[PDB]
């Protein structure tokens, strides 16, 4: 009886840490608004109407959001799918051309600058012999002076032909659920005070992830998942100042953003079946597009993140907020996409505070670019068509991406600057709970039963 | 009975439990293991990967003493030098992932012992039927 | 289909008897009329409501047979 015999059990619940390819699955409600209005409304299996998470018992696994897989997979999938929604659309090959630009008709201030240049140019008609003279409106940030006369050109004339985005398809986010194939499972940590590294005490398996609205936001990540009860800061290594700090707070901050300039879409015929959508007349006043937050909720939430930031640096610490230090446009200013229109808004009015260890609304101006160089590819730029009417959007600032400055030489205070940097910092604020594990059945254990021959 | 509730004992629900708890529910975990323009190629690669794994496990079971059963006794004695822990503490206390990380060194030796015992059982069964 | 058969009382055989009694409340038709007269599609559309219950009964009977077989070998 003391001599035991081996037994193999198949279907034993035990998993290992693994790296596989999860498959996207959007909701069928977006298929109801059909005909290629966004990406993945036709290239995605429809969701399960009962996402079935199963709460476990007496179990503890160690997680790591920073060496995690499937954030890289989300990045690669969104980049490649973004590239895939440009091949049916039009290349602007006959548009990199000599542009005769003047000032826009406006009461000109010599100290300031007009942000619109009115450019007329030669364009080929649908017929190859006849060419026409057609005019349009652009911003300063898309044209440059080539070297009396004043002739301009597009800024991307010497790197790439800009694929015009299809005006049929839109850029609003829809929730994608990444579902694991058979043999794999997804574990989500339901602990409240979980800083995204180390053993989590209450995990639960699920077949598909929750709603991830994919936002394009460098600083001040939008439409995220709110924290449970308090502000939570997360980093891979706090004393590392080259590692970004993800701040996710509890109550959202409402932010309004608008362009008040009323624009006119005008079609120009490039060739047979080729349409170029330009800006026509500016109906009304020439104003600066901007955004608003509440003063009191911003001051309160900065007090909250100060209260949480003093847990990592001691109590007697002076915390100040200063603006971004410098770089390109979309890493020093916060950039986002308000319904197919790209704003680049100044965040100097927000990170301008100091904090000691004892009805109004902040408005901030923006710039508007039409051509973008998203993910900074070597030969891939993209024009964006103008859209009609006054454009406004309401969003919720959910978190921050901060960076501690290079403190040495007896630093009494510690300052924090905003900075977007890599886009993967945005996606790690949403896949921080989940991990992907491989189910390996067929365990083996001894018992006191030998097989009868 | 009117007024009838239900707990939906789903897939992968006996992780932290003891061995004898998971031994009842393992059948549904074995059942859920299978089913589940470039994106079709990715999902196809994932699906045929899943069936590659399932067929690998079915073949690895089949050369042992059981073809399609889920519980299987063999004729190889449990070497006490592997884990030297007796019946009650491994059948009542220990969890599964702990049991995985306790004997993750002698697994291949156990595989070879099972295969050799099954093959000599094959030749003994073929020779028992030789004299008939 | 192979996996759905395999958790039941037969692994790869095509004919399979089990230890679950046929509940007469399902169809209440005796042996001769269902073995000589009735067709297959008719038999499909006659008991297309209790099929999952039959699946669960087979699975529970096979699993308790597994634990009884494992306990029969316990004393040996």
């Amino acid at each position, epitope marked *: 009886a003391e001599n035991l015999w081996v037994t193999v059990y198949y279907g034993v619940p035990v998993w290992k840490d693994a790296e596989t390819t999860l498959f996207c699955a959007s909701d069928a409600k977006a298929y109801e608004t059909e005909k290629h209005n966004v990406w993945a409304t036709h290239a995605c299996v429809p969701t399960d109407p*009962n*996402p*079935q*998470e*199963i*709460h*476990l*018992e007496n179990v503890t696994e160690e997680f790591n959001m920073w060496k995690n897989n499937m954030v890289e997979q989300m990045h690669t999938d969104i980049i490649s799918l973004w590239d895939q929604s440009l091949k049916p659309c039009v290349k602007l090959t006959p548009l990199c051309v000599t542009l005769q630009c003047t000032n826009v008709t406006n009461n000109i201030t010599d100290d300031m600058r007009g942000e619109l240049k009115n450019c007329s140019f030669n364009m080929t008609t649908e017929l190859r012999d006849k060419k026409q003279k057609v005019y349009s409106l652009f911003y300063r940030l898309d044209v440059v002076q080539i070297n009396s006369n004043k002739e301009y050109r597009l800024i991307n004339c010497n790197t790439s032909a800009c694929t015009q985005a299809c005006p049929k398809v839109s850029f609003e986010p829809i929730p994608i659920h990444y579902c694991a194939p058979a043999g794999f499972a997804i574990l989500k940590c339901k602990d409240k005070k979980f800083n995204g590294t180390g053993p989590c005490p209450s995990v639960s398996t699920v077949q598909c992830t929750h709603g991830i609205k994919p936002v394009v936001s460098t600083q001040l990540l939008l439409n995220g998942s709110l924290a449970e009860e308090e502000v939570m800061i997360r980093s891979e290594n706090i004393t590392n100042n080259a590692k970004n700090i993800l701040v996710q707070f509890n109550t959202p901050v409402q932010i309004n953003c608008t362009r008040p300039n009323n624009n006119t879409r005008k079609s120009i015929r490039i060739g047979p079946g080729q349409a170029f959508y330009a800006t026509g007349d500016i109906i009304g006043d020439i104003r600066q597009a901007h955004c608003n937050v509440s003063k009191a909720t911003w001051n309160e939430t900065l007090g909250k993140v100060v209260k949480q930031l003093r847990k990592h640096f001691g109590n007697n610490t002076i915390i100040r907020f200063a603006n971004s230090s410098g770089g390109d446009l979309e890493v020093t200013t916060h950039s986002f996409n308000c319904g197919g229109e790209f704003f680049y808004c100044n965040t100097s009015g927000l990170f301008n505070s100091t904090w000691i260890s004892n009805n109004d609304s902040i408005t901030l101006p923006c710039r508007i670019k039409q051509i973008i160089n998203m993910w900074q590819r070597i030969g891939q730029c993209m024009y964006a068509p103008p859209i009609q009417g006054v454009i406004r959007c309401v969003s919720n600032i959910t978190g921050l991406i901060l960076t501690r400055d290079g403190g040495s030489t007896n630093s009494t205070t510690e300052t924090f600057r905003p900075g977007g940097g890599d886009m993967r910092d945005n996606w790690r604020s949403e896949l921080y709970k989940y991990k992907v594990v491989k189910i390996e059945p067929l365990g083996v254990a001894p018992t006191r039963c030998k097989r009868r021959v | *009975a*009117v*007024g*009838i*509730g*239900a*707990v*939906f*004992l*789903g897939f992968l*629900g006996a992780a932290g439990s003891t061995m004898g708890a998971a031994s*009842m*529910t393992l*059948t*549904v975990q074995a*059942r859920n293991l299978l089913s589940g323009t470039v994106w079709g190629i990715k999902q196809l690669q994932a699906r045929v990967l899943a069936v590659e794994r399932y067929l690998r496990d079915q073949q690895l079971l089949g050369i042992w003493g059981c073809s399609g059963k889920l519980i299987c006794c063999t004729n190889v004695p449990w070497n006490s030098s592997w884990s030297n822990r007796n019946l009650s503490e491994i059948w009542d206390n220990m969890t599964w992932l702990q049991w995985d990380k306790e004997i993750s060194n002698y697994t291949q030796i156990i595989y070879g012992l099972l295969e050799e015992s099954q093959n000599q059982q094959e030749k003994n069964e073929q020779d028992l039927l030789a004299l008939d | 289909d192979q996996q759905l058969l395999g958790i039941w009382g037969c692994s790869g055989k095509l004919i399979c008897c089990t230890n679950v009694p046929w509940n007469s409340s399902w169809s209440n038709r005796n042996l001769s009329e269902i073995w000589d007269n009735m067709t297959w599609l008719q038999w499909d559309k006659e008991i297309s409501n209790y099929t*999952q*219950i039959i*699946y*669960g*009964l087979l*699975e*529970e009977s096979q699993n308790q047979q597994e634990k009884n077989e494992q306990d029969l070998l316990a004393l040996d």
Partner: antibody
Amino acid sequence: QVQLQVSGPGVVRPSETLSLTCEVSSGSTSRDFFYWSWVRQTPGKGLEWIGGMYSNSEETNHNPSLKSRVIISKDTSKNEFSLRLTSVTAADTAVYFCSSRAKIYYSASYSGGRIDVWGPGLLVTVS
Amino acid sequence: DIQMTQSPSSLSASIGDRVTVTCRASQGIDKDLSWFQQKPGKAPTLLIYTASTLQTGVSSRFSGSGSGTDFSLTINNLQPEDVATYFCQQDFSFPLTFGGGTKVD
């Protein structure tokens, strides 16, 4: 406290509202559902079921021997099963149990077992 | 409502006797009867569900027979942990009516 622990006031004034809460919990799945039930144990009579409600819906199923005088509510977020018995006389002096009502079935077809365990009660006296 | 009568109120037996508790119903509750064990002062815990199926956790001493309106719980080898009030529960139709109580001394 233990599972299905009933707490609240132990003395109810005459013809006021008895209001008791009970530590309930969610199931192992979001697909699960319980029926939480108030039962009283009287010295005079036996065990008497007071009422209850599904965890899925908000409909209340109760014993009409108390003549629809109960307000049976729940808060799954706050682990609350609540009885608000109204017009409480001394006949409702009893030890109240709150019970979980569910089945333990194993795989998606069959029934496999029912668990109707109770938690330790709280004596409520009306005078 | 469906009346449930449990008998006896109390039954006395020595250590190791097979005793029987008889639960009768007024109407058809065919196999919807539960058997519960309650320590004096403590909560009733489950013994038998569906009137013939042994619940996992309690021993094989608690067995159940009967059908329709009449059921009988059976205790083989009566134990000192069997000192408890037993209750048979109807769960066939609303409302839930339970037994009278059977004490073991």
